[PDB]
Every structure is written in structure tokens, then in C-alpha cells.
Design a protein around this ligand. Structure first.
Ligand SMILES: [K+]
Ligand code: NI
Lengths: 148, 157
């Protein structure tokens, strides 16, 4: 047997998703604290683009990137509390994503490097982690490799 | 047969990256000459990543593993220009420049920053008439392996 769920998505209509892809956000996301479950929808293998889609609110879907594909010097320090919270035990567990603010033209799109999405897919746990002590920019130009 | 409906226009297709999807018949694009090296693939659907972004896949409706990763090249190369010959205009029943969408095939590399785009041979789609082709441009200096990302420093000091 399998465990599949039909999910209404913002950009792709209804998709069938394995249940083990359903990520619990026990604390939701800041300003969306009641949104306790999301699914990661990648664009295409080998690309750094994704959407983080609410499994309960079709119109809530964050366009995100793997920032490490765009910004060579970007690093994320995970606090112990975040590690506990997401049941992380090892480096390979962890996926980092960053929210786009998509602009017209697309070349002006920015990336929030202060507040990454952190997902432990293995344990189906996620959160948005707000970095306080950093000099990262909440509006880093997506197409400027060098950090502001 | 003992159950009637008006849902015959919705087609179920297996996609490379999104699983099984339902697609409206009016999204099915006829490629009457197929695509070069895939001349038997006469029907594709355009699957956009997300509104406001230039990323799409061009998915065969007959062959699950044939899905081209493509971009709107104008989002990356503002000065890009595509000349449709008179015969292409007729082939795709274009009756207005607003009918036309241009896409360019990616060659996705690892790391992604090394990805190239084919600027010599765009995908040309008339969505209103559901007709497409790939057109190899003549008499241009466009690069078939144009870097998608700018890694050079251009000086006009
Ligand atoms: K909810
Ligand atoms: Ni089971």
C-alpha cells in the first residue's frame, strides 16, 4: 500500500503528494502562526527553485530558493533550540530555503537572508528561523552573488 | 457509460516533475513538426513554475520523461530579439504579435550557476491557436550555450 493525499496548489492545480512529504510547522510561520502544515514543491530536478505550499489554504504558497545556490558566502547558524524543535540529529537532515520577493522585472527580485525556512524532511518538521545577530539583508538582490 | 458528464475536455497526463495532473484541452499545444530530434512528439503542455517568474517546463503529453526546462529569455536578456520568418508566421497561424510566446531551452548543470540557455533556437508558441515549434534562427550570432548567469564584469567606465 501507499499513502497519498490530493493537495490543491496555488500554481499547479490539484497534485497527488505522498503523505511523508507533509511537513509539520508546529509553530506555523511568523504572521501565519495557524498554518501548521506545508509541502515542498520543487520546480525541477537540479534547480534551486521551489514553492512552499500550505496544505490547507490553496492561495498560501511561498516562492523560495536554496540560497546556497545563489550566494557562495551564505551560512546559517542553527541554534540548539531550533535543533531540538525540529528533531535534528545530523547535518544531512537539514534543508535551508529563503523567501523571494518577486518583482517586475524579475531581475529586481530580492531574497530574505535573515529568516530562512529550515526543514528536517526525515522527521517532517519545519519552521522559519529568524537570525538576529547577522549582517544579512532582508532584501538581498537575487542576482547579486555578493552579500549586502 | 451509464454515467454522463461534461468533463471530457479535462485530460489526465503523467508529468516528469509533478506527477499525474489534469489539463484542460485548450492547454494542449500542437507541435505539427514535433521538435528537432523529437519530431514524433506532436503535443506538449506548458507548465509554469509560478506567476511572476520566468521558469516553465514544456511537458510531452505522451511521454512522461520528456519535459524541457525552459525560460522566458527576455527576463534574462533584455536586448534579445527574435525574428519570425514569414513561413513561421503562417505555420503557427499568427495574426498578432500578442499571440506569440517565446521560450528558450535550458541545459541544466551542476552547480546550477553553470547552466546554459540556447538563444539560437527558441520555442515559439501561439497559445491562442495552440500551435508551436522550435525555430532555429538564421543569420544571428546568438549562442546555443549562452550562460544563464553573468560571471563576467562588464566595463564601460
Ligand atoms: K489552517
Ligand atoms: Ni502504511
Amino acid at each position: 500500500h501507499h499513502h497519498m493525499k490530493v493537495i490543491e496548489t496555488k500554481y499547479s492545480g490539484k497534485l497527488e503528494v505522498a503523505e511523508d512529504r507533509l511537513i509539520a510547522f508546529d509553530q506555523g510561520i511568523p504572521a501565519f502562526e495557524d498554518e501548521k502544515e506545508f509541502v515542498l514543491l520543487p520546480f525541477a530536478a537540479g534547480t534551486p527553485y521551489y514553492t512552499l505550499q500550505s496544505t490547507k489554504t490553496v492561495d498560501l504558497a511561498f516562492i523560495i530558493v536554496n540560497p546556497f545556490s545563489f550566494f557562495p558566502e551564505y551560512r546559517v547558524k542553527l541554534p540548539e533550540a531550533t535543533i531540538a524543535q525540529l528533531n535534528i540529529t545530523n547535518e544531512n537532515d537539514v534543508a535551508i530555503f529563503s523567501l523571494l520577493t518577486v518583482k517586475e522585472p524579475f531581475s529586481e527580485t530580492t531574497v530574505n537572508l535573515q529568516a530562512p525556512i529550515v526543514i528536517n524532511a526525515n522527521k517532517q518538521m519545519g519552521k522559519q528561523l529568524v537570525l538576529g545577530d547577522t549582517a544579512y539583508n532582508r532584501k538581498q538582490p537575487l542576482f547579486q552573488k555578493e552579500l549586502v
